[PDB]
Ligand SMILES: NC(=O)c1ccc[n+]([C@@H]2O[C@H](COP(=O)([O-])OP(=O)(O)OC[C@H]3O[C@@H](n4cnc5c(N)ncnc54)[C@H](O)[C@@H]3O)[C@@H](O)[C@H]2O)c1
């Protein structure tokens with residue numbers, strides 16, 4: 001049992017949200033069923049506190065947080081694993097990522113991107129200089145999804161501390177214990193408590209206050225398309241950064257050697273299954289050009305069968321469960337349905353509740369639910385595509401989504417064609433769509449996002465207002 | 475009376491119903507444009523969406539600089555069109571052609587610039603021998619909605635950076651001053667712009683306005699205008715990027731360290747800033763916050779300078795100050811001055827209004843809560859608010875409205891400049907200049923009710939009109 005953390009204070013309610021372990025379906029935790037008034041309190045505090053931390057101070061707090069994450073890595077990945085169900089291997093890696101996010105935000109504190117303009121540029125010119133500076137906002141509202149219960153929170157909070165913002169986080173009711181623990185880490189690392197609250201409860205009770213509270217200057221939301229478009233229909237006059245679903249391809253081009261196909265098959269299986277497939281930039285469609293597929297698909301199958309799927313707490317498990325059994329059952333149905341439409345299931349040892357094996361299916365029609373909709377689980381679906389780049393680019397672009405992509409090829413002419421032609425936020429050559437560093441620009445277009453970039457650097461910019469000032473300069 | 479059609483991707487499109495355009499000097503019809511409907515906007519957006527510009531950076535620069543040169547060659551004709559539908563003086567409308575020339579020149583020059591970035595990826599334990607590179611691509615279509623106060627320059631600020639960036643833009647200028655936008659579309663097509671890159675549609679906001687906000691092809695809405703209309707658009711442009719630049723109510727602050735020569739200089743700034751373009755700038759001086767102990771010396775200098783302004787027929791070359799937008803606007807601002815006087819203000823100079831022609835009224839001892847200075851009063855009123863000889867109290871009063879766009883601070887004391895720069899809740903603090911001072915390429919935009927927090931000006935508009943795409947390559 002864990003209360004809300006409202007500016008450093010433990011806050012409770014009579015009602016409870018239960019948090020269950022997807023492996024077991026047992027209750028492993030409880031948090032408050034928070035209401036509009038808790039968020040309201042959290043925001044009034046955030047609005048009123050004016051952080052004074054120097055850049056050195058902010059850096060100390062962020063670097064001390066990284067060290068605490070490293071020192072408590074097993075404890076934290078256990079909490080992640082117990083609410084989300086992903087393997088210890090995946091949750092320990094997630095802690096590694098959060099350690100990088102805090103570390104980099106800490107180091108970004110020394111950087112000042114101020115610019116200077118001279119004003120004698122036109123016949124209207126003046127002997128004057130204009131300078132820019134950045135300042136924090138009144139309050140930030142962050143709403144996070146279940147797939148990285150630690151790292152999504154780190155990406156929203158670390159840039160807020162680094163720019164002297166006060167943030168209120170509402171993690172998902174599915175995986176809220178990890179955010180609450182991060183809050184405690186932060187306060188113990190020296191964060192002035194009014195800079196961070198973590199509130200919890202049902203989306204119908206507390207969700208809308210996160211979107212409409214008068215003090216909020218910026219709402220930063222990561223989650224599903226429908227919830228994203230709902231928020232977009234309601235945050236009247238606030239900035240919103242909405243980072244929504246992905247459905248991302250790994251594209252295998254026909255110039256590859258057999259050895260290259262093995263390396264591509266390594267990227268395919270890892271891309272489709274890491275974090276149980278629960279990444280917005282997971283490989284969700286492997287688009288394999290006809291003339292190499294016969295060679296490529298048996299290499300994928302061989303690698304998928306090595307994956308050990310089972311008890312998430314076992315350090316030798318590769319693949320843990322998905323978020324719940326309902327999601328599992330749904331991805332299984334999409335497979336079974338793609339198979340009625342002509343797909344060829346090549347490996348499916350059987351679902352067990354929320355535990356899905358890394359099912360391999362070949363000849364997936366591009367228009368079936370499995371690959372046209374976002375399938376947020378460890379399916380490894382191969383879609384055979386024509387030996388023609390334009391048709392391949394057309395088909396890759398034919399869903400509602402556009403976040404990231406991976407292309408494997410050695411021919412530079414074709415690399416550049418895919419780079420220019422895919423309608424996505426990122427094109428990775430010879431990497432999975434999931435590849436990024438914590439500070440490069442990250443965000444999609446089309447239904448994958450409203451068009452703002454994130455990652456530590458862009459989030460820091462997003463979280464401030466630029467003020468200019470000009471001075472006589474004779 | 476000039477009757478003009480819409481410009482839809484180069485085609486001249488008329489409707490039978492007309493929007494009459496009146497000259498505020500004598501209230502007569504000088505023009506008509508079409509009462510366009512949702513389907514005109516819808517057609518324009520379908521063309522914009524389907525056209526993929528292929529212009530090289532060189533060809534964009536040629537078009538943009540040819541457009542600058544045609545604004546210069548035709549400045550008389552263009553400033554006549556502006557004055558006839560807005561009523562600002564020829565002096566002010568000629569100035570506005572000069573600014574649009576700078577906007578187009580600067581955008582053409584910015585086409586050579588590539589702000590791409592490179593990241594090495596072997597930074598952490600999760601490393602990789604790899605580089606990430608960034609590049610920018612255009613949007614599907616941009617919707618631009620523009621206000622009456624700069625009928626050319628506001629269209630230029632929205633259109634030039636779209637062209638520089640291979641975007642296609644649909645403009646709906648205000649129904650009060652649409653003729654200037656249509657002339658600029660002509661000039662652009664004739665400077666070599668592929669016509670599918672620009673449409674100008676016209677009509678009543680009840681007919682065509684919602685289509686500009688909600689059309690399925692529009693990636694970004696760029697709107698400049700009043701707070702309430704801006705809040706409506708914000709609320710209706712679901713899942714679109716929005717650049718919303720709304721009202722200002724900007725202070726010029728006179729600090730008590732200034733000598734009596736410095737006060738004469740500050741008075742030049744107050745009078746120019748309060749009255750330029752008939753006071754119709756979102757960054758006009760609309761509140762002169764003068765610290766009490768210098769106010770008795772500063773006010774007479776303001777008074778002397780205000781009485782030098784010639785106000786009259788805007789087409790007369792001897793006019794400095796022409797009309798405001800219409801008679802109703804002019805009456806409202808006079809009525810706010812009369813209300814301020816009943817609540818304690820002192821009207822020092824008021825030669826009388828006639829119709830939409832408001833003289834540069836000087837009022838002292840204006841209460842800071844009165845409507846004149848608390849609300850945005852978009853006319854050539856010169857209102858002095860006496861404030862305490864204390865910087866904390868001054869800053870608090872300056873920050874006490876719903877607005878936060880620009881500001882100006884007159885002082886010689888560095889410590890006090892820095893305190894105002896850091897303490898004023900605004901987008902810009904100009905030291906020893908009017909709030910309205912900027913170059914066409916520095917970041918422009920306000921906070922609070924003054925803007926949804928995105929910057930404009932040529933450089934920032936170019937960035938907001940693109941998507942950044944990243945790519946990464948093996949780099950062993
Ligand atoms: N950066 C990205 O683009 C990115 C990264 C990771 C995940 N995702 C997307 O996240 C999705 C999975 O996450 P999820 O299932 O938690 O998504 P979700 O959209 O169901 O919920 C995400 C968050 O929104 C909150 N929420 C739900 N209803 C709400 C309401 N009415 N008002 C306010 N808040 C509300 C939830 O409580 C949760 O905190 C996938 O589609 C994935 O692609 C995107």
Ligand SMILES: NC(=O)c1ccc[n+]([C@@H]2O[C@H](COP(=O)([O-])OP(=O)(O)OC[C@H]3O[C@@H](n4cnc5c(N)ncnc54)[C@H](O)[C@@H]3O)[C@@H](O)[C@H]2O)c1
Nearest residue numbers: 620621622647648649679683699700703719720721722756
């Ligand atoms: N950068 C800035 O912040 C900036 C610069 C200059 C002017 N302004 C502001 O503009 C205002 C003066 O201009 P205005 O009177 O033309 O403002 P306005 O808000 O009345 O109209 C501006 C535009 O919005 C359109 N519009 C009106 N109703 C609409 C609707 N329902 N749907 C869609 N579009 C609609 C108008 O037709 C016009 O094109 C002042 O408040 C001034 O400060 C702001």
